[PDB]
Amino acid sequence: MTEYKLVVVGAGGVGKSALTIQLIQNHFVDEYDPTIEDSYRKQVVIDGETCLLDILDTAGQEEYSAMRDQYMRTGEGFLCVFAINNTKSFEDIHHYREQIKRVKDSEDVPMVLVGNKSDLPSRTVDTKQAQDLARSYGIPFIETSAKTRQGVDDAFYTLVREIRKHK
């Protein structure tokens, strides 16, 4: 079975841990220490093939650490996550893409833009705004809720399929 190295990046609070745990463990977690960086593992079937997902869930104080840097260099695709109710997190997306672009030294990096917390009504970022950003980056945009599981499989599996095609 093929193995895929996925990295989840984005501002503190957007739901990187909730998304990852929802994928891996099938639970919504609403109190997960924001300072914990961890790797997660799950065997999944994608398009009929058993896959092994290894997923790095990132914490803010690790951003410029050497060990992060090793994960980023070996990571094969990246979820860039913001929260649709937090404009600052959407403003931040360029920063995280720019860091990926630098470490990968590539314009050809599998990536998905993720608008999380789509179950919350107090929206501040339009889908059109995110789809325009995603278009400018050459990447897909996927709406997710780690709470309801909307789009969670789609976001991670879409990233895998990009990696698969890339390889």
Ligand SMILES: Nc1nc2c(ncn2[C@@H]2O[C@H](COP(=O)(O)OP(=O)(O)O)[C@@H](O)[C@H]2O)c(=O)[nH]1
């Ligand atoms: N309503 C809602 N809350 C979420 C969602 N994802 C994360 N959260 C909440 O937002 C807060 C931050 O989540 P967390 O996963 O720690 O964000 P991280 O800092 O990016 O890991 C937590 O209180 C979560 O319960 C979501 O899809 N919907």
Ligand SMILES: *S(=O)(=O)c1cccc(S(=O)(=O)Nc2cccnn2)c1
């Ligand atoms: S870490 O402890 O070095 C670690 C833990 C689990 C898996 C892996 S890896 O799959 O070898 N690399 C990797 C890169 C990016 C995202 N996830 N895993 C390393």
Ligand SMILES: [Mg+2]
């Ligand atoms: Mg977290």
